From a paper:
Peroxisome proliferator-activated receptors (PPARs) are members of families of nuclear receptors, which play an important role in lipid metabolism. PPARα is mainly expressed in metabolically active tissues, such as liver, kidney, heart, and muscle. For physiological functions, PPARα regulates gene expression involved in peroxisomal and mitochondrial β-oxidation, whereas PPARγ modulates the expression involved in energy storage and utilization. Many research groups succeeded in determining the cocrystal structures of PPARs with their agonists, suggesting that there is a common mechanism for the activation; AF2 interface is stabilized by binding of agonists to ligand-binding pocket (LBP) of PPARs ligand binding domain (LBD), and this stabilization makes easy for PPARs to recruit coactivators.
Author numbering:
A (entry chain B): 203 to 255, 267 to 467
B (entry chain C): 686 to 695
C (entry chain A): 203 to 256, 267 to 467
The structure:
């Protein structure tokens, strides 16, 4: 069962529209025909609103879209992790509730560089500076995810690593409300064993990578919590900015 | 405005 | 509390919509428990059902309109049964339903569709998807897109108890333009959507991640409506001979 890594990788490539390879090519990549449309000024945002389908609220709404897609891609990805199907239905749900936004912010790193992030399936690139620019507290949505990304991208993971990581994020026996905790800790051991063995054969150069990586699953927990609060507060601060009911439900009681 | 909806919701 | 809410909403849905998924599934791919549904393929088959139960294109555009108007009426009643909806600012009640109804219609319209055609005239007619494609431009572009969406939606295999909860969630949606007390709706939605999830988990144990799949369609319906709204203005302005029942003309103004 040295294929477990490969099965998870296949699942990861099959379900997620954007991956590190696609994103790295587009970023600092030649105009294979056309480079990706840059969004600096508020004029540059509008210029791209009807192009591929207030000001701060347009962003808050647009973000939501890809989160919602990704939750769905993640529920499918999850059902490919060996043993996940067999978990208690109740547990399947608990693991993904807490799991998805960790898996989102990890994979969101793959479209980020120091200057901005890819959006709209790789066709947009919205500048980190423009996002800082936004009226408080909308500026405090992206920047923290940038901070995290720069440190995480620093580890130089490839998609084969990231797939194994996201699985390890999902199968995580210390989520609140789990029943069959034991059978998950076994499921994680297997995924994480492979993750280490994989990192040793793929990154022999960096033999502290596996420990460095693990201590990021913690930073992601924090990043999410902080995100979750900031979003409820924007939803309740601004009558102008609502939250897709799926996201409002994955947030409910967290 | 919406004359008819107003009417159906009273 | 939420014990009733789901069931109260379901009762409301059964009380106000005479065509429901169960009635429609029986009639579709059924035998003849008494009488099977009259099929409308060629233009001969249309006319031979225009005194039976009721240009050629414009007869269709007018008949569509009629059931839309009945359904908006059923929807305004359904809405007034959703716990807390009555208490909303009447102005808000109206804004929520203006943007709401055609999303709710296209969701519920899925329930009378299969890959080959749709039930009409309260289950007595069945008009073939192929005949509708057949129509002169742009009348052919009316139903097909709603079929495309339906096949994906029917794929989820929802029961009326699910659909009721979803349509409520569609109606109580605080990101409609022009709402006053957005807050009192967002709370109303949270409750409806929580129950929708809990309901889907207990009622479809087979497909535990149905709740997320369903909710990503609230977006596709918004699109489907917009695309509909354009195509309607174009038919309104193409044929001076086929105008728009004032209710529909009112839900459409500035959308
Ligand atoms: C409401 C709060 C909202 O916060 C966030 C915060 C960070 C990230 C997201 C999700 N995300 C969308 C960012 C771009 O979103 C746009 C899209 C278009 C656009 O143009 C106008 C501008 C921004 C994204 N996830 C990915 C996973 C992998 C790869 C790429 C990804 O990208 C949502 C949430 O919680 O859902
Ligand atoms: C004006 C443009 C008009 O477009 C549409 C587009 C899609 C759907 C409708 C409303 N509708 C179609 C039945 C009419 O179709 C015929 C066809 C032939 C016929 O032969 C005599 C009689 C009726 C309908 N049915 C339903 C069943 C269940 C739930 C909801 C339902 O909604 C109208 C609009 O915007 O309102």
């Amino acid at each position: 069962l040295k294929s477990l890594a490969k099965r998870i990788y296949e699942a990861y490539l099959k379900n997620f529209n954007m991956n590190k390879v696609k994103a790295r090519v587009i970023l600092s990549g030649k105009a294979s025909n056309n480079p990706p449309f840059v969004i600096h000024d508020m004029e540059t945002l509008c210029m791209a609103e009807k192009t591929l389908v207030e000001a701060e609220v347009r962003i808050f709404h647009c973000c939501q879209c890809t989160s919602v897609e990704t939750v769905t891609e993640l529920t499918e990805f999850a059902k490919a992790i060996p043993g996940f199907a067999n978990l208690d239905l109740n547990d399947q749900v608990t693991l993904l509730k807490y799991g998805v936004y960790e898996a989102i912010f990890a994979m969101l790193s793959s479209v980020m560089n120091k200057d901005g992030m890819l959006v709209a399936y790789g066709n947009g690139f919205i500048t980190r500076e423009f996002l800082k620019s936004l009226r408080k507290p909308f500026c405090d949505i992206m920047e923290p995810k940038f901070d995290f990304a720069m440190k995480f991208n620093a580890l130089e993971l490839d998609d084969s690593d990231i797939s194994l990581f996201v699985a390890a994020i999902i199968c995580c026996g210390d989520r609140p409300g789990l029943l069959n905790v034991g059978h998950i800790e076994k499921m994680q051991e297997g995924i994480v064993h492979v993750l280490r063995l994989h990192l040793q054969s793929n990154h022999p150069d960096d033999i502290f990578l596996f420990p460095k990586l693990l201590q990021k699953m913690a930073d992601l927990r924090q990043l999410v919590t902080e995100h979750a609060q900031l979003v409820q507060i924007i939803k309740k601060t601004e009558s102008d900015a609502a939250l897709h009911p799926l996201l409002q439900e994955i947030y409910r009681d967290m | 405005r919406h004359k008819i909806l107003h009417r159906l919701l009273q």
